[PDB]
Amino acid sequence: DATVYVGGLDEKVSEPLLWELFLQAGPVVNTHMPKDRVTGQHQGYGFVEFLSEEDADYAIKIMNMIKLYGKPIRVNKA
């Protein structure tokens, strides 16, 4: 309930960059970025787990108009 899924991100975005983007709406406790170890590239999706479910819902509700590298990033509940 406290984890939100972020999609639509480019492969050039990094995990500290995603943490600094997510910290503008609330402190994130953890950030997981699934990436293939064979090629070393991201899959374009991530999971941001905050300290509470209401803060995660407020972060997912306020990230519906975010654009990174020309691509709109979508936030959903997970």
């Binding site: 953890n30 999971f47 787990e49």
Partner: protein, 70 residues
């Protein structure tokens, strides 16, 4: 290979009673999965926060006693 599984401590059955008595095929793999999302989701059902004191906690009663002692 059997050499890479015998030298790295693999193919050793370990039981984790916190995450529904799951199986782990390594001590280092269990130590890496203890600070992960699955162990955090297993510990969040009992009400224990994800901290450094419950890193080596396996039983649910020992984790409940460590959460009640603090």
């Amino acid at each position: 290979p059997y050499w890479l599984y015998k030298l790295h401590g693999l193919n050793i059955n370990y039981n984790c009673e916190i995450c529904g008595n799951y199986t782990y095929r390594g001590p280092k793999a269990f130590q890496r999965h203890f600070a992960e999302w699955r162990h955090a989701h297993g510990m969040r059902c009992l009400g224990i926060p994800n901290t450094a004191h419950f890193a080596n906690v396996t039983q649910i009663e020992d984790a409940v006693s460590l959460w009640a002692k603090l």
